[PDB]
């Protein structure tokens, strides 16, 4: 039936979603920021995995269909995200097939984050800002770490960009970089390999 193909694709989807640790008392802002991000990601992964197991069991198994499970069944038949899963910023309501891939990418990023946090050491990592739920929280935590380590003033901190913080996952829009000098080209977008951010007062 339609539920047989639904169960086949329902076992197809969660094969990239396995688990995430939970790892909350540290002075540095990066540590608590990564701790709450890993907690949010593990909570969302647990909710998504439990809902997928529940809809698998109500498809082919001894589980009856509730109101929430019926809403989940209809929403995943139509392919649109249910409103329970879409907690973070999804651009203009994308389909579920790209969304579970983005979810797996974020979960893998948080898994590497927790692996690095299992052992400063947290400054040595490289981050793609698209895989975080709140990127400006990471930027303000970086600024707070700089102001904490160097005892500087938060009001006049500026940004110096090179191509001591490593940022990956950056994509331009119709421009190219050559020794930190922008040039114009007919290409739609290029990917910046690694971007070094350093906070300077002047």
């Amino acid at each position: 039936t339609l539920h047989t193909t639904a169960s086949n694709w329902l076992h197809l989807i969660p094969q990239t979603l396995s688990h995430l640790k939970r790892t909350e008392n540290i002075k540095d802002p990066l540590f608590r920021f990564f701790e709450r991000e890993v907690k949010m990601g593990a909570k969302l992964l647990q909710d998504v995995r439990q809902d997928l197991a529940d809809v698998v069991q109500v498809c082919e198994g001894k589980k009856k269909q509730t109101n929430y499970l019926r809403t989940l069944i209809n929403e995943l038949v139509k392919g649109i995200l249910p409103r329970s899963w879409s907690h973070y910023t999804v651009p203009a309501g994308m389909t579920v097939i790209q969304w579970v891939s983005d979810f797996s990418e974020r979960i893998k990023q948080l898994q590497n984050i927790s692996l690095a946090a299992a052992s400063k050491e947290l400054k040595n990592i490289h981050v793609c800002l698209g895989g975080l739920f709140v990127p400006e929280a990471y930027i303000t935590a970086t600024r707070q770490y700089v102001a904490q380590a160097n005892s500087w003033s938060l009001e006049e901190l500026c940004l110096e960009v090179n191509v001591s913080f490593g940022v990956t996952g950056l994509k331009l829009q119709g421009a190219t970089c050559n020794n930190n000098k922008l040039s114009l080209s007919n290409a739609i977008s290029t990917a910046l390999p690694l971007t070094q951010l350093r906070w300077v007062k002047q």
Partner: protein
């Protein structure tokens, strides 16, 4: 016998002091003697019924029941009769004044005159028989007074409702009568000779008139008075003693105040013109000039003098440098005069003047940083210009306001003090755009998210040009006739409209309103070059001071969008982020601070950090609306700390003052996770920060006394009830600073008891009686919450919230003296709570579809006992103060102590032997409730257990409390059935110790399946050390605790019963 005789002596004292009481009859203009002195009678009857209620309980009331009960119901019928009597007299006074003073009513309504004469004859017979016998008992002694008074009230209400068509006729006489409701205009027309009744109503008419300065003869109006005590003296006083009508001398007052304000504006600008020619100025003459004039004229004269100085400098760099030097010198003079303690009216005058002077400093620096050589350069033309022509013969047209290809007059409406806004570059862009919309004869329309300064920039532009402004908050019940009525009111008055939240107005109705808007714009285009326009198919006069402004938010709560034909009539303007740095710097410069700029530079990035670093919540606000209240509280606590130091100049720890205000304002919104993040933010932003709190020992001990009175467990801060008392202190601080309050948090955190205990503690401390109105908004419709406009006959009924606020405003029972707390006990959603976004605003007033604006007195606080604030938008979340009650604030041992305290006292069938049964039951259930024991671990385990419904603590806790109350009643009837042998204490122990286990099983597992309650039964069997029915197969649910303290099987209870052949399948 001596105690009973003392109670009878107090009863005789009640008899004597009520025999001495009487009705105070005072002659009213040689017509009849009417009774006065009403709040004295109200508190007399209240304290007497309180005395009878206090002597009811204990200890020798039983011998003297009858006389005290007779005095109780005597006071009850006296209270009822006089409560209807005060309303009857109050209605009759203005109805008699209207039916005597107004003419051609008998020609108009003859049946109304005949009835009113019949009820006036009956009423004057009632005055004759009270004036014969002015005793209260004698006036009560006439039979059938209650039926006669109810019929008189019915006849007064009839005559009022059948007269109401005529009032609209009077609304065509005076324009401002359009802004008045039916009862208030009834009082206004009725008491035109009494005059002193009308002074409560002048706040709704004019912007800055609160009461009229009246002669002792009550026939010459000497001037007008604001709500802050500032008064304008009339140069030529209007003679009421010539006997004009009410609208005639009202229009004379309106014209006289404009002529007078223009005259003192001319004198004040002469004073600043002779003052500003000196490069060095004397501060004593400056402060006497400041104390001489009003704030509006002083700021206006400063603007005129600065504009003329810059223009004569630009006639021609060095004169502009001289103007900048004089501006900086006056700024230093204002800073030196504002850094010391001053009276508050001249303090606000100094704050307005220092804001305007630093705005002119910024503008003068903006011209002087570039090369400007002529006054026709656009850079000077891009800012506001003021022109005073002294040779002009008409002082109403003497002042011109010139902005970029736009010229305006001055309406000269009195404003009072009000709030002076900050001229940010965004505010300069808004001013330029909106006056360019006004120059093309187009209405204005700002849009953006809430918390940007949209309607307040419009209102300060209205007060900047001196035009009378009005603010309406339109909801979906705004009709065609209501909008046309307020539009013709704005037409005849000549006032600016500031229609807020237009987007929720029912798209067809928006399109219908667009035609009247087009008619108004066509009339203004005709005026722009005997000019009328058609509203409601009626041609009416349009004043040149017309302007309409549309404050809306795009998709805040899914509100409707504007049609395209109406979008052309209103120019659009977007403000999404105002400059927080400059407004913070100027507010800290204006309150009086040494390191004001560093405080702004350390608090605006601090708000930027705290907007992102804390977790996303439904009730989090870190916008400019919170920043302004934070700065206001910082100024208030800076004045408080300076006065505390000077109770026993010099510098003060301003950093600690700002941090303390930030903590006191922004702690109770946060959940338990976000407190150390804010603490680390305050440590990283401010190095020498520190903290301080508490110091409310009298309030804390009164909270302790009233907590132990009403069976609550007070805490000392770190005890079992410490966090709840701390949150009640936070609620007290927010009610001290804020206006309306969210009490957010999960259900079962004691928020109801929190506001009740705070109200009773404040009543016990300050002596002001606190009355609370609890309203569930979702239990009734929205049209019943606020009121209905009847579509056939345009009458405005009263909703529940409208009736409560109107009863507060009327203050017939002296309700303004008491504290009024209106709590909404529902869930906040933008269907109805978006009608209060002007009440919770700084505009402080309630709008109605009838045009009847109800201002709110500051005694009333509006709170919300609510669950979660997800459904509300930021028009309500950002516009209130949030107190967060987490689920672990009310701990479970607190509820156990409450149950044991309610078990020991307050006997169940409300000393008694069953009260002793309750006490012994409390001592034998005491080792089970406290710490982990039995109840806490089982309740923790039951949360892991799944249920059919959602299981929290309080439902099954109340279930268990009803279980143990029935156990106490069961012991009571067993002692009733066994009089020879009472309830033995070892039997009671071994009975209750099993009844509690059976009860907690049916409480934490009575709402699920058989397997799951069997699981909780075997959990109870495995964990606790109680005697148990020894059968590993049969669960404990299948047993019943007996009266002998043992267990009987439920399967042994059911018999093998057969039923008759006749009744086989009867229901």
């Amino acid at each position: 016998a001596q105690g009973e005789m003392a109670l009878e002596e107090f009863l005789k004292q009640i008899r004597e002091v009520w025999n001495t009481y009487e009705l105070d009859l005072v002659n009213y203009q040689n017509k009849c003697r009417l009774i006065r002195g009403w709040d004295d009678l109200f508190n007399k009857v209240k304290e007497h019924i309180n005395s009878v209620s206090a002597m009811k309980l204990s200890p020798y009331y039983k011998v003297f029941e009858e006389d005290a009960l007779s005095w109780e119901d005597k006071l009850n019928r006296i209270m009822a009769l006089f409560d209807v009597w005060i309303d009857v007299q109050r209605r009759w006074v203005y109805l008699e004044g209207i039916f005597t003073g107004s003419a051609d009513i008998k020609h108009l309504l003859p049946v109304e005159t005949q009835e009113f004469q019949s009820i006036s004859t009956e009423f004057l017979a009632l005055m004759k028989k009270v004036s014969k016998s002015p005793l209260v008992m004698d006036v009560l002694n006439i039979q059938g007074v209650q039926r006669s008074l109810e019929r008189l009230a019915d006849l007064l209400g009839e005559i009022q409702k059948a007269l109401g068509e005529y009032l609209e006729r009077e609304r065509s006489s005076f324009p401002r009568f359009y802004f008045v409701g039916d009862e208030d205009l009834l009082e206004i027309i009725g008491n035109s000779k009494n005059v002193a009744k009308l002074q409560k109503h002048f706040k709704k008419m004019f912007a800055g008139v609160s009461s009229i300065i009246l002669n002792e003869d009550n026939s010459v109006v000497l001037g007008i008075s604001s709500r802050e005590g500032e008064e304008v003296m009339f140069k030529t006083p209007v003679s009421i003693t010539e006997h004009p009508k009410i609208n005639e001398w009202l229009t004379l007052v309106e014209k006289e105040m404009r002529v007078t304000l223009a005259k003192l504006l001319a004198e004040s600008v002469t004073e600043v013109e002779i003052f500003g020619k000196a490069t060095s100025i004397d501060p004593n003459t400056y402060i006497t000039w400041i104390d001489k004039y009003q704030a509006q004229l002083v700021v206006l004269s400063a603007q005129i003098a600065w504009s003329e100085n810059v223009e004569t400098a630009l006639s021609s760099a060095a004169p502009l440098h001289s103007v900048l030097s004089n501006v900086e010198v006056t700024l230093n003079v204002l800073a030196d005069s504002v850094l010391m303690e001053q009276p508050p009216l001249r303090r606000r005058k100094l704050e307005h003047l220092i804001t305007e002077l630093v705005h002119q400093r910024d503008v003068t620096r903006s011209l002087i940083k570039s090369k400007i050589d002529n006054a026709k350069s656009f850079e000077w033309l891009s800012q506001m210009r003021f022109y005073f022509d002294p040779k002009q013969t008409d002082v109403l047209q003497q002042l011109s306001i010139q902005m970029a290809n736009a010229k305006f007059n001055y309406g000269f409406e009195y404003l009072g003090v009000q709030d002076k806004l900050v001229q940010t570059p965004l505010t300069d862009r808004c001013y330029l755009t909106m006056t360019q919309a006004l120059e093309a004869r187009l209405g204005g329309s700002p849009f953006g998210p809430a918390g940007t300064g949209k309607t307040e920039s419009v209102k300060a532009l209205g007060h900047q040009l001196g035009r009378f402004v009005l603010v309406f908050n339109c909801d979906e019940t705004f009709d065609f006739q209501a909008m046309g009525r307020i539009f013709v009111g704005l037409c005849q008055v000549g006032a600016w409209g500031c229609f807020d939240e237009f987007n929720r107005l029912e798209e067809r109705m928006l399109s219908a309103v667009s035609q009247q808007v087009q008619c108004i714009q066509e009339a203004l285009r005709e005026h722009s070059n005997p000019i009328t326009c058609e509203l409601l198919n009626k041609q009416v006069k349009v004043s040149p001071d017309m302007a309409i402004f549309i404050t809306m938010n795009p998709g805040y709560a899914g509100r409707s969008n504007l049609p395209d034909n109406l979008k052309k009539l209103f120019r659009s303007l977007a403000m999404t982020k105002p400059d927080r740095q400059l407004i913070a710097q100027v507010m800290l410069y204006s309150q009086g601070f040494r390191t004001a700029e560093v405080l702004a530079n350390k608090i605006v990035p601090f708000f930027k950090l705290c907007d992102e670093q804390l977790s996303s919540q439904s009730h989090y606000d870190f916008g400019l609306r919170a920043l302004k209240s934070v700065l206001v509280s910082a100024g208030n606590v800076k004045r408080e700390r300076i006065q505390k130091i000077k109770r026993e100049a010099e510098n003060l720890p301003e950093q600690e003052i700002l941090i303390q205000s930030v903590c006191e304002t922004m702690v109770p919104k946060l959940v338990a996770e976000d407190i150390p993040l804010l603490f680390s933010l305050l440590s990283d932003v401010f190095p020498g920060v520190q903290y301080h709190r508490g110091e409310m020992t009298a309030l804390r001990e009164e909270l302790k006394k009233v907590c132990q009175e009403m069976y609550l467990t007070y805490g000392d801060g770190e005890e079992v009830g410490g966090m709840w008392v701390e949150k009640v202190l936070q609620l007290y601080q927010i009610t001290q600073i804020n206006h309306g309050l969210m009490m957010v948090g999960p259900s079962g955190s004691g928020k109801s008891m929190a506001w009740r205990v705070l109200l009773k503690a404040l009543e016990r401390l300050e002596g002001v009686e606190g009355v609370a109105h609890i309203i569930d908004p979702k239990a009734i419709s929205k049209d019943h919450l606020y009121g209905t406009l009847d579509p056939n006959t345009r009458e405005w009924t009263d909703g529940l919230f409208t009736h409560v606020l109107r009863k507060i405003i009327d203050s017939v029972r002296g309700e303004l003296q008491k504290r009024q707390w209106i709590v909404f006990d529902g869930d906040v959603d933008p269907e109805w709570v978006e009608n209060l976004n002007s009440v919770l605003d700084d505009n402080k007033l309630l709008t109605l579809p009838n045009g009847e604006r109800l201002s709110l007195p500051p005694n009333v606080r509006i709170m919300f006992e609510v669950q979660d604030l997800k459904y509300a938008t930021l028009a309500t979340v950002s516009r209130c103060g949030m107190v967060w009650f987490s689920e672990d604030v009310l701990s479970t041992d607190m509820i156990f102590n409450n149950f044991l305290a309610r078990l020991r006292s307050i006997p169940l069938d409300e000393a008694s032997p069953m009260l002793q049964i309750q006490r012994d039951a409390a001592t034998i259930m005491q080792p089970y409730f406290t710490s982990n024991g039995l109840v806490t671990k089982a309740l923790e385990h039951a949360f892991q257990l799944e249920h059919i419904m959602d299981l929290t603590r309080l439902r099954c806790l109340g279930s268990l409390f009803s279980m143990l109350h029935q156990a106490c009643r069961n012991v009571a009837q067993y002692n009733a059935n066994h009089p020879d042998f009472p309830m033995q204490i070892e039997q009671l122990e071994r009975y209750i110790q099993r009844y509690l286990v059976y009860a907690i099983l049916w409480s934490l597992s009575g709402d699920s399946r058989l397997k799951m309650r069997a699981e909780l039964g075997e959990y109870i069997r495995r964990i606790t050390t109680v005697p148990l029915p020894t059968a590993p197969n049969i669960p404990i649910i299948d047993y019943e605790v007996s009266i002998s303290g043992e267990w009987s099987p439920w399967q042994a209870k059911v018999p093998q019963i057969e039923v008759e052949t006749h009744k086989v399948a009867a229901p």
